[PDB]
């Protein structure tokens, strides 16, 4: 289809915030693998990461949004500008009015849909980050003195089994409560 605009920025990712220490002041930069993941350090090692399930649901949302916007445009009509005499152009005037109205209306509709869906998906991404934030927050009521400032910590030490278990999301709150 044709539109009479200059650009419609169908957008997939997140805001360019190039800033380990927290994304409130600035989003992670070294991350390359995906969208959202983890960076923790302990006695046993360290490392970056990118989560899978959140990113998989998100990219499913992306494919749904692109295929929606491409498959939610209906048929196309051969809008060829026809010809009329120098005596009958009331026909021509009305036809030009109709065609300009149609291209105008579709410009408006395409722009509005782009705005709507791009905002909605980017705030979807934001809300996904937030839900993972609150999920990891949940079990940590009293056994990791949360330093604030956007990034978390562990009150104590723990080995590979600890990091894998919290990787799943089942952090052992009462188990390590000896202070």
């Amino acid at each position: 289809k044709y539109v009479r605009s200059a650009k419609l920025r169908m957008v997939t990712g997140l805001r360019n915030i190039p800033s380990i220490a927290g994304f409130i002041e600035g989003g992670w930069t070294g991350m390359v693998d995906g969208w959202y993941g983890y960076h923790h350090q302990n006695e046993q090692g360290s490392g970056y990461a990118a989560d899978q399930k959140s990113t998989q649901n998100a990219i499913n949302g992306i494919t749904n949004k692109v295929n929606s916007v491409i498959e939610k445009m209906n048929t196309q009509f051969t809008a060829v500008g026809k010809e009329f005499n120098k005596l009958e152009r009331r026909m021509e005037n009305l036809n030009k009015k109709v065609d300009d109205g149609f291209l105008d209306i579709w410009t408006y509709n395409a722009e509005l849909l782009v705005l709507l869906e791009n905002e909605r998906t980017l705030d979807f991404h934001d809300s996904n980050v937030k839900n993972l934030y609150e999920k990891v927050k949940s079990q940590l009521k009293n056994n990791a003195k949360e330093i604030g400032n956007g990034c978390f910590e562990f009150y104590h030490k723990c080995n590979n089994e600890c990091m894998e278990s919290v990787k799943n999301g089942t952090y052992d709150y009462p188990k390590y409560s000896e202070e």
Binding site: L8, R9, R15, N16, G27, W35, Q41, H156
Partner: protein, 51 residues
């Protein structure tokens, strides 16, 4: 003893429009406005044009 979350923010530098901000820069954007015409007439599924 640290662990925390963040969103991958690469260097991609294309700007997208919002009703609440002026052309925010955001990483990924599969454009939708195809605007690259070859500039010359071409076949129609192989059937020549009646020139």
């Amino acid at each position: 003893d640290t662990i925390c979350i963040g969103y991958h923010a690469n260097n991609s530098t294309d700007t997208v429009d919002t009703v609440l901000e002026k052309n925010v820069t955001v990483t990924h954007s599969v454009n939708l406005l195809e605007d690259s015409h070859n500039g010359k007439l071409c076949l129609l599924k192989g059937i020549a044009p009646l020139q």
